[PDB]
């Protein structure tokens, strides 16, 4: 779905996330939860949080941010040859967690936001381009597996 040049850019950018996977992970989830409060309800571990401050002071949330970005990073490093790593992820988000693909769209957007926020001026037009496409590829492959399961919504 991407050229090596574009994969090259995705992994360059990923290097920025890797310098602080917890702070990036936390800011992604807070952006998600504050822009779409209904997503919070999918987590029994975090639905207690009400304010952004409480979210900001939650170490467990930072922990989960790490788990998420660790797993994404692992997929991205496969440069599209991620069937093995993605399948389990699509299966648990569809039948156990009951996560609509729109929420994956939401988090995808939330990653681009955060990158711009944390790195104003050094998250280029080409880098946005490649990152967006990889996130889309990720989303599409998930959508394929959702379809097979009839996870309709
Ligand atoms: C970048 C996209 C995502 C990645 C890489 C990711 C990754 C993970 C991983 C690795 C786990 C734990 C293992 C498992 O249960 O599969 C997990 C758990 C979970 N995810 Fe995601 N996830 C993503 C998006 C989302 C979104 C958008 C939602 C909801 C809005 C969500 C809701 C959950 C929930 C409810 C759990 C169970 C948490 C627990 O009780 O510990 N995920 N996710």
Q: Token pair 């990653």 is at which residue?
A: 111
Distance, CA of 146 to CA of 142 (rounded, Å): 6
- For ligand 1, atom 7, name the residue with the nearest CA: 68
> DSSP H helical segments within 19-124, as ranges?
21-35, 52-57, 59-76, 83-91, 101-118
Distance 93 CA to ligand 1 centre (A): 7
Q: d(Cα 130, Cα 134) in Å, to the nearest integer?
A: 6
Half-sphere exposure of 8 (CA within 13 A, CB side): 5
| Resolution in Å, one decimal place | 1.9
Tell me what percent of the chain is helix, strand and coil, each rounded to the nearest 5: 75, 0, 25
Say yes or no: CB of residue 123 within 6 Å of ligand 1: no
Ligand 1: does its nearest atom lie under 6 Å from the Cβ of 43? yes
The experimental technique used to determine this model is: X-ray
Sorted by sequence, the CB contacts under 8 Å of residue 62 that are 6+ apart come out as: 22, 23, 25, 26
CB 115 within 8 A of CB 123: yes
Q: How many angstroms is it from 19 CA to the middle of ligand 1? A: 22
CB 46 within 8 A of CB 33: yes
Task: Place domain 1-153 in its CATH homologous superfamily.
Answer: Globins (1.10.490.10)
- And the tokens for 18? 């890797």
Q: How is residue 147 written in tokens?
A: 């379809």
Question: Residue 79, by phi and psi: left (phi above 0), alpha (psi -120 to 50) or beta?
Answer: left
Contact 82/2 with Cβ under 8 angstroms? no
The structural domains of the chain, with segments of one domain joined by +, span 1-153
Token duo for residue 81: 């040859």
Best probe residue, ligand 1, of 65, 70, 89, 93 (max atoms within 8 Å of C-beta): 93
- Secondary structure (3-state) at 81: coil
71 phi/psi in degrees, rounded to 5: -70, -40
Tokens 């822009």 label which residue? 35
Q: Which residues contact 123 (CB under 8 A, 6 or more apart)?
A: 13, 16, 115, 116
Count of Cβ atoms closer than 10 Å to residue 23 Cβ: 14
Calculate how far, in angstroms, residue 64's C-alpha sits from the geometric centre of ligand 1. Answer: 8
Q: At how many degrees (to 10) do helices 125-149 and 59-76 cross?
A: 90
| CA dist., res. 48 & res. 55, Å (int) | 10
CB 139 within 8 A of CB 105: yes
Q: After which residues is the chain broken (C to N over 2.5 A)?
A: none
**N residues, the chain:** 153
**Long-range Cβ pairs for the range 29-32 (8 Å, 24+):** 29/55, 29/61, 29/64, 29/65, 29/68, 29/110, 30/55, 30/56, 30/61, 31/110, 31/113, 31/114, 32/103, 32/106, 32/107, 32/110
- CB-side exposure of 18: number of CA atoms within 13 Å? 11
């Amino acid at each position: 779905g991407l050229s090596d040049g574009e994969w090259q850019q995705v992994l360059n950018v990923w290097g920025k996330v890797e310098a602080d996977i917890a702070g990036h992970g936390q800011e992604v989830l807070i952006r998600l939860f504050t822009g779409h409060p209904e997503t919070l309800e999918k987590f029994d571990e975090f639905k207690h949080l009400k304010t952004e401050a409480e979210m900001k002071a939650s170490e467990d949330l930072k922990k989960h941010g790490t788990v998420v970005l660790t797993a994404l990073g692992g997929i991205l490093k496969k440069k599209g040859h991620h069937e093995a790593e993605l399948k389990p992820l699509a299966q648990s988000h569809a039948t156990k967690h009951k996560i609509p693909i729109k929420y994956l769209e939401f988090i995808s957007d939330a990653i681009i936001h955060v990158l711009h926020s944390k790195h104003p001026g050094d998250f280029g037009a080409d880098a946005q381009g490649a990152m967006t496409k990889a996130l889309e590829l990720f989303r599409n492959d998930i959508a394929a597996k959702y379809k097979e399961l009839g996870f309709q919504g």
